Ligand binder design. Structure first.
Ligand SMILES: [Co+2]
Ligand SMILES: [Co+2]
Ligand SMILES: [Co+2]
Ligand SMILES: [Co+2]
Ligand SMILES: [Co+2]
Ligand SMILES: [Co+2]
Ligand SMILES: [Co+2]
Ligand SMILES: [Co+2]
Ligand code: NI
Ligand code: NI
Ligand code: NI
Ligand code: NI
Ligand code: NI
Ligand code: NI
Ligand code: NI
Ligand code: NI
Ligand code: NI
Ligand code: NI
Ligand code: NI
Ligand code: NI
Ligand code: NI
Ligand code: NI
Ligand code: NI
Ligand code: NI
Ligand code: NI
Ligand code: NI
Ligand code: NI
Ligand code: NI
Ligand code: NI
Ligand code: NI
Ligand code: NI
Ligand code: NI
Ligand code: NI
Ligand code: NI
Ligand code: NI
Ligand code: NI
Ligand SMILES: [Zn+2]
Ligand SMILES: [Zn+2]
Ligand SMILES: [Zn+2]
Ligand SMILES: [Zn+2]
Ligand SMILES: [Zn+2]
Ligand SMILES: [Zn+2]
Ligand SMILES: [Zn+2]
Ligand SMILES: [Zn+2]
Lengths: 231, 231, 231, 231, 231, 231, 231, 231
C-alpha cells in the first residue's frame, strides 16, 4: 500500500522507483470514459514524459503533478503517434517550454490528424532504432519504430534499467476482443510490426499500453494473433 | 408534378427535400450537347455544392439559382476531380467568396489539367475516408476516396440522411456501352475502385453520376464489370 | 432592463440589435481581474466574431453563448493583433471549424508573440483600408489599418449600419492615465495612427475598446493626446 | 471615313496603320458605363496586346476581333497594373495560350487585388526602362516604369515607329476634374511619376489612356498639375 | 533534284513541304564525325523546332537558316531529352527569345546531365500523351512519352498532317548493330517503350531518328528486338 | 582566497555564488594571447551558458569543468553575436545535446562570418527586450538587444538576482584605448546602443565584457564616449 | 624500406607513387583502437582526398601531412558515406577551404547521422557511375555507386592509372568474421552491391577498405559470401 | 620588348611578373570594336581570373591561353558585376569546372541582366571588405565593395604584392569624356563609391579598368569628378 494516486482528473500508478503511468479520460458516446495511458520517467535530475493526455488541460495537470510529486524540470517529451490521446496536449507542453519529440512521420501527419506537431522530428535507422543524433538527452528512453500497425507513424519506447516496454496503441492486452480503432491502420503490416516490437525489447516483462493496465508479454503475442486475421 | 426546372442554360432536378442535381451542358463536336451533373445540398441554414459546371459563367448561374430558390449562404463547395466538367467553374466560386475543397491530388493535378485549384486540400485516411480535420463544416457530406479509376484523384460523396451517393465520373449508368474518357484513367485499379465506392456506401439506393440520370446500384455493378475488361 | 448577461466566466453586453460586446477576464498579479473586450455581430443568417478571449476555454464559451442566444453559424472571425487578449483563443475557433482572419503582419508576428496564427491573412491598401479580395464575406465589418501604435500590426473595425467603431487596444477611454502596455508599441507613429482611426470612421459615436466600457469619440482624442507625449 | 468598329460589346478605334485602341465597358452603379482602353499592335507577322478588358469574356472578344480583322498570332500581351480594367481578363489570354507579361510588382500584387497574375515578370532598371532580358520579342513596345502614381506597380508603353505613348491609368485627359480612383495611389510620388512618363517619351504627340479618348501632351501636364495638389 | 542543303556546318534535308531535318556534327575520338538529327516544322505563319544541335553555335546556325530560308518567327522549341545532342544548344534558343519546352523529367535531369533546362515543363497523362495545357501552341506536333528507354525522360514527336514520327535517340535504324549509348538507359523497360512509340503513331511510315537517315517502321521493330536482349 | 581556477587551457573566475566567468585564449600574431570572456550561471538544478569559447575543444573543456565543479545539466546556451570568440564553439555545444540560442540576425549572419548557427533564434520586441516566447527556460537571464554597435547582431544579458550585466564585445573597460575590431561595426549607432545597454540594466554595478576583467559602470560611459567619436 | 610514416596520431602508408592510405584511430569501449582508412591521391599539381578521419582534429593533421610531404593544394575531397569515420572531419576540410563532395543521399542523410554535409552533391547514372557534370576536376578518381549495402548511400572509388579500388566500409578483408556495423545496412541488397563493386573495377588487384590493410580481390568475394547469409 | 601577345581574338598584356590583363572585343554599331579588360593572376601553383570576356567562346580562349602560357589549374574566377562584358562568358568557366564567384547582388541581378549567375556568392562586411569565409582560396585577391556606382553590384579587386588595383567599369581613365553606360547606374552614390575605391587601395599606383589601358590614380580622381556632376 497505498493505491493509485488521484490528481485532478487523472490517475498516476507507480510502475517502478523512477517510472509512473499517467492516465487521462475522455468521454466517448456509448463507450463510457475511455482511459489513455502514458509514462513519466525520472532520470537523475530531470523528468521525461511519454505521450500527452487527451487534452491540453489534462496535460497541464500532468505537469502540475510532476512539480508537486517529483519537483524536477521536464527535460523533454516524446509522443508516440499523431492521434488525440497521444498528442492532444501538445500546446500545454509547448506553453511550459518543454522540448517535444515525435516521429518525423507523426509531425508530417499532425495537420491532417488535427494535431499540433512536435517541435523536433525523430528519424529512425533501417533497423527501426532511432538515430541518436535526432534524440538528444533521451537517457534511458530507447525509441523504436516497429513499422506500420495501429498507424503508419506509431513508435514504441523501452525504459533502460527496467523491465518495462511501452507499446502505445500498437499493443492491446492479452484478452482484447479487437484491435480497436483501425481508421488509420496498416492491416497488411500490423502483425509483423507487433512482433518486431516484441523482438526489439526481448527482455521486457511489463508491457505498457494506451488503453489497458500493464500486461505481460502475452499482450504482444495476442495482439499479433489478432493482427494476423487482417491480412 | 411539376418537372425539372430550367434556369438559364442549366437544369435542376430535385432528388430529395434538401438535395438537387445541377446539370450544365457543353457542345462537343459530334457528341451533341454533353450533360455534366453535380449536386446541391441544403443543410440547415447553409448550402453545400458538389462539383462546378463546365464553365465559370454556368457556375455563376448555379449560385444565382441557389440565391433565388433557396436563399441561404453557400458555406462551401467540394469538387470531385481535376477535369473541366467538375472544376471548370472554380473562378466563379472563388469570386463569390465560397470556400472550395478538393482532393489534395486534384489540386496538385489542376495545373497540368488546365484547372484552377481549390483553395483547400482534402486528405484521406488509409481506409479511403476523408480525414475530418481537413473537411470542416461538411455536415451530411461523407467524402470517400475509392482509389484510382476514371482519374487518379477521383473522389466520391455520400449524403447522410438520404439514400443518395454521388460517384461522379467514376460511375456510369447500368447500360453504358463504355467507360468513356479514359485519358487519365487507371485501367489496373479502376474495377476495384468502383467496388470500393459501392462498399463505402452500402445502403445507397440512388446512385448519382456525372453524365447520366440517377440510377440504381446496378450502375455500380455494371461499371465494375466494364472496368474488369481493362486489366 | 435587463442587464449584462453573465455566461460562464464571461459577460455579454448588447450594444445594438445585432452587436454584442464579449468580455473575458484574466488574473494579473496585482492588477486584479483584467477585462478584454471583443465584438459579436449578427449579419443576416450568420455570426461574425471580432477578437478571441484571453484563452481557448473562454473562447469556446463565446461560441457556446452564440449557439444558445443566437443560433447561427459563425461564418468567420477577425482578430485585431497578435497579443494574448486578442488571439489567445485561436485554437478554439479552429477546432470549431471557423475561418479566421488577421493582418498579414499579425500572422507573421504570431510565433514570436506566442500566438497561433490566423488561417487567412488580411492585406491593406496604401490608404489603410483592407483589400476586399482578402476579406471575403466580411459583410458589415469595415476593416482599417491605421498604422503602428499599440503594436505594429494593430487593426481596427467599423460596423456598417451602426454608430460603432472598434479600436481594440489602440484606443483607451477618455480618462485613461496611460497608454498601458507599450512593450510592442511604436511610440513615434502611435499618435498619428490614433487620429487616422478617428478619420477612418468619422461618424462613429460609440467607440469600443479592449479594456474599458464603450466610450464616446473623446476616447480617440484623449488617446491621441497621450500618444503625442511619446514622440 | 469610316468610324470606330463595333465588335460584340467592344469598340476598336484605329490610331495608326498598325495600332488599334480596344475599348470595353463595365457598368458601375451611378457612373454609367465606364470605358477602359487598351492597345493592339501589329508588328510584322504577329499581334501584340496591351492590357486586357474588364472581363475574361470581353477579352476573348478582343482575340476574336484580332483573328477576324488581322489574322496573325498574338505573340504576347503586356498588362499595365493589377486592377480589374487592366488584368480582369488574364484567364482568357492564358486559355488562348498567349504569353502574358506584367511588372514583377503587378504579379506580386495580383492576389490581394483579386487578379490573376501574368505568367512572366518584367523587371526594370534603375532608370525606369525595362530590362530587355525580361521582355523578349516585345518589338516596338517600349516599356517604362515611371514610378508609383495611380498604383505602386503602374507601367507605361511607347510604340516605336509611331507618335503614340500609352499612359494607362496614370494619365487623365487634359480636362479631367480629378485623378479618379486613388484607392491604391501613391499621393507623394504621383506627380513626379507623371512627369517621368512625359520625359521617357518626349516625342510622343498622341497620349493614350485608360478612360478617355487619345489626347495631346496637355494630358500629361494637366495630370501632373492635379497630382501636385496631393503632396 | 536538288540535294541536301549545306548551311554553315550543318545539313538540312527537306522531308515534306513543311518539314526539314536539321543535322549537326560533333567530333568524337575514334567514331569520326557523329551526326545528330532534329526537325524543323513550318506551321502556317510560324516555325516549330524539335531538338537543338550539339552546341549553342550550331543551334544559332539553325535559327539563321530558318530566317534565310523560311523567314517566320520560331514560336517554340521542344527538346526530346537531357543529353548534349538534344539540349546542348538551349542557350542559343533562349538568347533568341524562343520559348523552350521539355519533359518535366528532362528539366529535372538537366543539371546532373550538364544541360541547361528548358523554360517550360511538359507533363504527360498516364497514357503517355502530353497534357495539352502544358503544351500550348504546339500545333501539328503530337508529343508522346513512350516510357523509359534510351533515357528515363526520352519523349517522341509525331507531325500531324504528315507520315512522319520522330523517335529521337530511342530509335535506331533497321540495321543498327547496337542500341548505342546506354549510359542512362532503362534496360528493363526499353523494349516496351519502343513498341509503345510504334503504337502511339501507328500510321507513320517515315521514322526520323537522331543518328541515322529517316527509315521505315522496320527501324521500330529492329530496335525493339535489340532491346529485348537487355532484359 | 583562493584564486581563479585553472582548468585545462581555461580560467574560471567566480563572480557570484551562482555565476562564473569562463575565459579562453587564442594566439593572435603580435597581440599575444587574447582572452575572451563568457558566463556560466547556476539556476536551481540546471546550468546556463553565455557564449562559447574561441574553439570547439575549448568549449568542450567548459562543459567538462561544469560537470566536475557543478554537476548539473546544461539546459541551454545563448551566444551574443556571430564572431569566433562568441560562437566558435557551437559544434561542441550541439554534440553535447545542448539547446543553443542566438539573435535571429546572428544565425542569419553565421554563414558569412564562418560560424555555425545556433539551433534556435531569439526575436526582440521594438523596445529591445527579447520576446519571451522565443526564449523558453532562460530563467534569470534577461536578454536585451541594444541596437547595432560592435556588430549589427550583438545582444546583451543581465543576470536577475545579481548586480551583473554582460555587455559582450559591445563594451570595453573604462580605460580602453579603442573600440577594437570595428570590422563589422555600425559606427553611426554604436554610441546610442552602448547607452541603451546601460539604461536597460540601470542597477547593474558589475559590468562583464569579452576582453577585460569585470569593470564598473564607468566601462559603459567610457565606451559610449569613444563611440561618439565615430559619428 | 622504410616503413609506414607516423605523423601526429595518424599513419600514412604509400600504396603507389601517387597514392597514400591515411589511417586514423578512435577508441571504442572494448574493441581497442579502431582504425579507419582513407586515401590521398597526387594528380599532377594537386592533391585529392578520399574520406576524412574520425575527427576534425585528425583531419587537420591529414592536411598538415599533405603540406609537409607533398606541398600541393588539396583541390577537393570526396567522402564515401555519412558515418563518423568517413565524414567526422568535414569541418576541418571546410575550414581549409577545400571543396567537398559526397553522394547526394549522403548529404541528405548527414543530419540524422550527426554529420556535417559535404558542400557539393554527387549524382549517379542508372548504371552506377557518377554523372561527370557533378564531379568536376575529379581526375583519376572514378566514382561508382554499387547500390545499398553497408549503408544506403555508400559509394566506391577507383584510381585510374593504378590497380587500386577503394571499397570503403562496404568491403571487409578476406578473413573477416562478420560484416561489422549493420546499423544502417541494407541486408537485402548488400551482396549484389558488393559484386557490382567488383564488376565496376574488374581489373583492380589491390582492394582498399576502411578497417583492414589493403587486400586482394578475395576481399570482395568473401564479403559478398558473408552478405548472402543476410537475405 | 616584346609587345602585347595576340592569342586568337584576344590580347594579353603583362602588367607584373604574375599579373596579365586579358582583353576581348565586341562590335558595337557605330562605336567600332569595344575592348573589355579583365585580369589573370598567377599565385604559386594556380591561376586566378578576374572577369570573363564578352562571350563564352572568347572566355574559352582565355583558358586556352592560360594553359599554353602558364600551365597551372585555374583555381577560381571572380566577376565584378552582372553585365555582358564581365559575366558574358560564365558558361565557359563552368564547363571547364572552374569555381566562380560574384557579389551576392550580382547573382541576384544576373537573370534580369541576361547573365548566368556565378556558382558562389560573395558577401561583404559593412566596411566594404569581403567576408573571408565567402571568399576561400582568393590568395592575393583583395575584394572590396565600394558601394553603388556603375551598377548597384559593382565590386573591385586589389592584388596583394603588387601596385595594382582593378576598378572594373566603375573607373574610367583620366581623360574620359563621360561615365559611359549609366543604364544601371546609381547617380547619387557613384562619386562616393569611386572615392571609397581609392581609399580602399590607397597605395595602388596602377589602376586597371574595363575599357581603357591601365592608368594612374588620376583615373580615380577624374572619375569621381565626373560623377559629382550627376548628383
Ligand atoms: Co491544443
Ligand atoms: Co476559370
Ligand atoms: Co491555444
Ligand atoms: Co478571370
Ligand atoms: Co550552352
Ligand atoms: Co566548429
Ligand atoms: Co565537426
Ligand atoms: Co553563355
Ligand atoms: Ni529545439
Ligand atoms: Ni544511422
Ligand atoms: Ni510491405
Ligand atoms: Ni490470446
Ligand atoms: Ni481557407
Ligand atoms: Ni486519420
Ligand atoms: Ni496496385
Ligand atoms: Ni450490365
Ligand atoms: Ni488595392
Ligand atoms: Ni514614419
Ligand atoms: Ni483627456
Ligand atoms: Ni513562359
Ligand atoms: Ni540592367
Ligand atoms: Ni520618395
Ligand atoms: Ni489643365
Ligand atoms: Ni490529363
Ligand atoms: Ni516496370
Ligand atoms: Ni532487324
Ligand atoms: Ni512582443
Ligand atoms: Ni539610424
Ligand atoms: Ni574614460
Ligand atoms: Ni562550390
Ligand atoms: Ni547521365
Ligand atoms: Ni531491390
Ligand atoms: Ni572466405
Ligand atoms: Ni564580418
Ligand atoms: Ni544613400
Ligand atoms: Ni580630369
Ligand atoms: Zn491512435
Ligand atoms: Zn473527368
Ligand atoms: Zn495588445
Ligand atoms: Zn487601376
Ligand atoms: Zn541521348
Ligand atoms: Zn565580435
Ligand atoms: Zn559506415
Ligand atoms: Zn557594366
Amino acid at each position: 500500500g497505498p493505491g493509485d494516486q488521484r490528481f485532478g482528473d487523472l490517475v498516476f500508478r507507480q510502475l517502478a522507483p523512477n517510472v509512473w503511468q499517467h492516465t487521462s479520460y475522455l468521454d466517448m458516446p456509448g463507450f463510457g470514459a475511455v482511459a489513455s495511458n502514458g509514462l513519466i520517467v525520472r532520470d537523475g535530475g530531470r523528468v521525461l514524459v511519454v505521450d500527452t493526455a487527451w487534452t491540453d488541460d489534462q496535460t497541464a495537470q500532468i505537469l502540475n503533478w510532476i512539480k508537486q510529486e517529483i519537483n524536477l524540470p521536464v527535460a523533454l517529451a516524446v509522443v508516440t503517434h499523431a492521434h488525440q490521446d497521444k498528442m492532444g496536449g501538445m500546446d500545454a507542453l509547448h506553453a511550459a517550454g518543454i522540448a517535444t519529440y515525435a516521429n518525423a512521420l507523426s509531425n508530417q501527419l499532425a495537420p491532417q490528424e488535427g494535431m499540433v506537431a512536435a517541435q523536433h522530428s525523430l528519424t529512425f535507422a533501417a533497423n527501426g532504432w532511432v538515430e541518436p543524433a535526432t534524440a538528444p538527452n533521451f537517457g534511458p528512453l530507447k525509441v523504436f519504430y516497429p513499422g506500420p500497425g495501429h498507424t503508419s507513424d506509431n513508435i514504441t519506447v523501452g525504459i533502460d534499467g527496467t523491465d518495462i516496454a511501452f507499446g502505445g496503441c500498437l499493443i492491446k492486452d492479452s484478452k482484447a476482443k479487437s484491435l480497436g480503432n483501425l481508421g488509420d491502420a496498416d492491416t497488411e503490416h500490423y502483425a509483423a510490426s507487433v512482433r518486431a516490437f516484441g523482438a526489439a525489447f526481448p527482455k521486457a516483462s511489463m508491457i505498457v499500453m494506451s488503453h489497458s493496465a500493464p500486461d505481460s508479454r502475452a499482450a504482444i503475442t495476442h495482439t499479433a494473433r489478432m493482427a494476423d486475421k487482417l491480412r
